[PDB]
Design a protein around this ligand. Structure first.
Ligand SMILES: Nc1ncnc2c1ncn2[C@@H]1O[C@H](COP(=O)(O)OP(=O)(O)NP(=O)(O)O)[C@@H](O)[C@H]1O
Ligand SMILES: Nc1ncnc2c1ncn2[C@@H]1O[C@H](COP(=O)(O)OP(=O)(O)NP(=O)(O)O)[C@@H](O)[C@H]1O
Ligand SMILES: CN(C)c1ccc(CC(=O)N2CCN(c3ccc(Cl)nn3)CC2)cc1
Ligand SMILES: CN(C)c1ccc(CC(=O)N2CCN(c3ccc(Cl)nn3)CC2)cc1
Ligand SMILES: [Mg+2]
Ligand SMILES: [Mg+2]
Lengths: 352, 352
């Protein structure tokens, strides 16, 4: 049986696949042609069907896992296309997490003799995050931060050491947001969550701009001016609000300029896309900051696919967390953002 | 000079006016006809121009203030129409607060010999809130809560005593949101704020539905089903997420069903209005809860005009704060929601 872990989320399915690279001549002879065709199909293609994608740049090479050497692959596709995935399979032990492990349990069981083992979506997240950082990203740091996030002529990605990762606040930005406090490898809790997450960005952006993909939404936002839609402190005060240290550039009311009909008539789709991105990102940062102060944790790591190919939100989080915490909190990021649950699920294989 | 206090916000101007009712025959003889016409104009009209409104139901009758007996009146109009207000005046000591006291300082000074005294928008809020509760609402409680907010066959408005109001978390929902921790009459601090406030509701609702007023937005929301736009826990898990006590009805991703084109094509304007209201209200509740836990305050009072004629948001806040805090926090409301800054400004008159 191939070694898979699967995280079936509200929006995306993430799949981690361990490809053994120490196959003997005798082991290849014992390989059924269905398994061999699966391994060939996955390792010789980077697009699967019309919506599946292998993130080749994330591959971990020559990893030792369960006493075998191999490559760890990272694959994603929309949860909407899970029926195609299951039908493809209908032509084996599956460790699965995310809400879809429960919602689609009966569908996975239409694969004859398949053993489905449902694992918790946040236990899997913590285990996979700790594992990937422990093995490194092909010798490079898995964790990074933006140094000097306040001065743009200096702001640059730099590695961060998590060899002693505790305590740690983990902010998982998926369709919605879960916030975890991790005190040890066996001691973690879900602090809270917010429903203003990546699905809010994508859904509102699609309603407001007619964009048809996450990538298009980001491209629109990169060209926009959020201050055409947002009301700033200086729009209300004429300057800073000095008494409480609020600079004139801070947003006082997200989309607040859109109460005026003439402004709604002049705002561009790109402005609205950027305002949606800024609104969602700032809110996540502020909730993360409040949770960090409550949990007395100063390292906040942001994961989930809202931040995939999304440097704008990462830099906004890095700047905002540093600025509003007066330097007490640091925003951290991980190279394998969206895949930690899928890896943690795969790591549950020995217990079955 | 007439006794006024003014709070010039990003969206609305609030005006508190003390009408003396113990005028002697000699005092009426000393009254200049301009002052008499001002008093007559304000007390004989409930609509002023096309956009000014006197909230007659809020009037405090036979109040003793600065050694005089009178009626305290509450008047509002859009900040966009402040030029009309100032031009009307151009045909006197003004205690003013809100950002507009700074932004429009020079405009108020076009009134010859007018002394403008700018006061802080949150100092004025605390002073006015404490004052109005102290004098009562014509013998009735100023503060109320929703008893049994979890069972709708029981949920009802009931009075709440604030005779010892400390400590108190004050959540001011205006264009944006300010959160204050009040430990004593002279000891309060702004904990944080969020830009996802009443202007976000109104601006997003106008973009999404084409509504042209706050009242129309609420009417649309009252007819809508937010679950047509929002993705719920049960949409992701097929039921509750039992491990973390998340019920299937909780919103997992606000507007998260709007990532699907077919759902965007079937959602109604009313559904979108209600989703906007729910999204903004739940986020404010959650931020308030996190702040209350951090400040170790269990009484959270919500003010500002986002909640004016907005029973849906008040009941959502009452239910949500009680449910998610497992009964540790209580949502409180005040009858004179939007006017506390204007009253606090008026109360600053003796110091000038
Ligand atoms: N190709 C993509 N398609 C859709 N959304 C994308 C894509 N790439 C990035 N995103 C963003 O990533 C978010 C989903 O992140 P992800 O961490 O995979 O969540 P999920 O696991 O599917 N949802 P959840 O059930 O809440 O844990 C979406 O809401 C988008 O903001
Ligand atoms: N007649 C109205 N016109 C506009 N907005 C209204 C009206 N009635 C209620 N609202 C709501 O009330 C909010 C403004 O509340 P308010 O407390 O008066 O804020 P403000 O003081 O003008 N703004 P701020 O500078 O942030 O303190 C708007 O964002 C709407 O959500
Ligand atoms: C990823 N996934 C399954 C997921 C993610 C996010 C959520 C939202 C969430 O966690 N909550 C709890 C806190 N909450 C409020 C609301 C009001 C208050 Cl007054 N307090 N809390 C809002 C809903 C749910 C599920
Ligand atoms: C009423 N009026 C003048 C007003 C109201 C609301 C605001 C917003 C606000 O208070 N802030 C501070 C906190 N903030 C963040 C953001 C990111 C992080 Cl990581 N942390 N905090 C956001 C902006 C400003 C002014
Ligand atoms: Mg997920
Ligand atoms: Mg205000």
């Amino acid at each position: 049986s191939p070694w898979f872990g699967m995280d079936i989320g509200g929006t995306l399915v993430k799949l981690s696949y361990f490809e053994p690279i120490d196959i003997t001549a005798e082991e290849e002879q014992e390989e059924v042609e269905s398994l061999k065709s699966i391994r060939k199909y996955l390792t010789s293609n980077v697009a699967y069907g019309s919506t599946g994608i292998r993130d080749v740049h994330l591959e971990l090479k020559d990893l030792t896992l369960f006493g075998r050497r191999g490559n760890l692959h990272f694959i994603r596709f929309p949860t909407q296309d899970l029926p195609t995935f299951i039908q493809m399979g209908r032509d084996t032990v599956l460790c699965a997490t995310g809400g879809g492990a429960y919602k689609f349990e009966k569908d996975f069981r239409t694969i004859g003799n398949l053993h489905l083992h449902k694992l918790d979506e946040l236990d899997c997240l913590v285990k996979g995050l700790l594992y990937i950082d422990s093995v490194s990203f092909n010798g490079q740091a898995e964790c990074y931060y933006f140094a000097n996030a306040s001065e743009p002529e200096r702001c640059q990605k730099m590695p961060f050491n998590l060899d002693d990762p505790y305590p740690l606040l983990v902010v998982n930005i998926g369709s919605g947001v879960s916030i975890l406090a991790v005190h040890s490898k066996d001691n973690y809790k879900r602090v809270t969550g917010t429903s203003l997450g990546g699905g809010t960005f994508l859904g509102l952006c699609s309603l407001l701009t007619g964009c048809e993909s996450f990538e298009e939404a980001l491209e629109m936002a990169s060209k926009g001016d959020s201050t055409q839609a947002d009301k700033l402190v200086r729009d209300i005060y004429g300057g800073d609000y000095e008494r409480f240290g609020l600079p004139g550039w801070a947003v006082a009311s997200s989309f607040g300029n859109m109460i005026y009909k003439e402004k709604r008539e002049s705002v561009s789709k790109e402005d609205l896309a950027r305002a949606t991105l800024v609104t969602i990102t700032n809110n996540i940062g502020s909730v993360a900051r409040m949770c960090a102060v409550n949990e007395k944790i100063n390292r906040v790591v942001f994961v989930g696919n809202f931040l995939r190919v999304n440097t704008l939100s990462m830099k906004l989080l890095a700047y905002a967390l540093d600025y509003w915490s007066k330097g007490q909190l640091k925003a951290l990021f991980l190279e394998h953002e969206g895949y930690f649950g899928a890896v943690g699920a795969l790591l549950g294989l020995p217990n079955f």
